[PDB]
Amino acid sequence: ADTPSSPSIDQVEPYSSTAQVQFDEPEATGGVPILKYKAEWRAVGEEVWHSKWYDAKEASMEGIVTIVGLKPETTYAVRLAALNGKGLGEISAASEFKTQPVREPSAPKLEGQRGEDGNSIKVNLIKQDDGGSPIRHYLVRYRALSSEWKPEIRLPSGSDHVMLKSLDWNAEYEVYVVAENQQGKSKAAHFVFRTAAA
Amino acid sequence: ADTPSSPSIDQVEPYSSTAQVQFDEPEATGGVPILKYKAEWRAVGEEVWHSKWYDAKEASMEGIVTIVGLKPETTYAVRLAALNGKGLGEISAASEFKTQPVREPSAPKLEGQRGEDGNSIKVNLIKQDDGGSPIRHYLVRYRALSSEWKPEIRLPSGSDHVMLKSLDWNAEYEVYVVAENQQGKSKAAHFVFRTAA
């Protein structure tokens, strides 16, 4: 019959463009189960508050609710409210945070695996911290030691591996993989291998 | 009329115990809409996959789905599936990633504000990276310059400010605030000020 009491904010882990808000359910539900959570955030200096609804069942099974699309290095204020059949409840105290800056991506971990034949190798990618911004491409470079670099390969962020077929036999190669985002390139992850004799 | 194809993972941002997965949805085939997305993850080396459902609509507006309850410094494989009225589509290929290690928290930023009376001040906290693990406490310490440290105050993580009242008038003070999690304490943030006459 009543509206919910305020949710309580426990954590606010800020990232570059997203922020994870950890909270506790309201002490009082008002008499009707909590259906959704209204998140409100505002850039320090703005008047209007941005909002978004979150499903109560999913929110509680996660313990968190992630607000997205924020600007890096900005001070924000964020608060919550619970909505039940009767209506919207009292809003929480406004927690304040500042988002992190976008940094270059860290290097990916590389894992070698056998390819179809002895003169080929498959390099599996193990993703790493991207710096706070989506990864644009993966730049792969390789060569047979003491020899020229084959043409550089560009890979989509979603790529999980890179195959290097039709190589020279009984030859030693080195592969360089770099992760790149809107901010720049990462340190290169190198990997060295040797094809079979025949 | 059938189940949808597999989604496509475009990004996986790993943190310490969570990971943000970005992806492309499949075509909505079969005349019916996509209802949910199934996220599956397994620490590389295990056999049993974990899982969680994500409302399709919410995911589509968010742009990501966040898997939680992961262990730090661990290699995981994640894959996604799309659900619709006719049933669960095919899982996507595994995407591997490694969670970050847990670090100490970063110090919080302090901002001063007037208090109820001229002999008090309100110290607002501007929260910051917690090092990948929940903040346990906010250790605060203040004092009038050229005197001993007042007793330490322990603020719970949900605190947004520290109020210092019943201070001497026309006196100079400084505040020290440290954020602390399981990993340890951060470097302290300072704030010096002077009460009114």
Numbering used by the authors:
A (entry chain A): 497 to 694
B (entry chain B): 497 to 693
Original paper wording:
The neural cell adhesion molecule (NCAM) is the prototype and founding member of the immunoglobulin (Ig) superfamily cell adhesion molecules (CAMs). NCAM is present on the cell surface of neurons, astrocytes and oligodendrocytes, where it mediates homophilic and heterophilic cell adhesion. NCAM is involved in neuronal migration, axon growth and guidance, as well as in synaptic plasticity associated with learning and memory. We conclude that the NCAM–FGFR1 interaction at the cell surface may be transient or stabilised by avidity effects resulting from receptor clustering and that conformational changes within NCAM may have a profound role in FGFR1 activation.
When examined by size-exclusion chromatography, all three mutants eluted as a mixture of monomers and dimers, similar to the wild-type protein (data not shown). The relative orientation of the two FN3 domains in the M610R mutant is less severely bent than in the wild-type structure but still far from fully extended (interdomain angle ∼ 120°). There is no domain interface to speak of in the mutant (240 Å2 buried), and the conformation appears to be stabilised entirely by the crystal lattice. The conformation of multidomain proteins often is influenced by the crystal lattice.
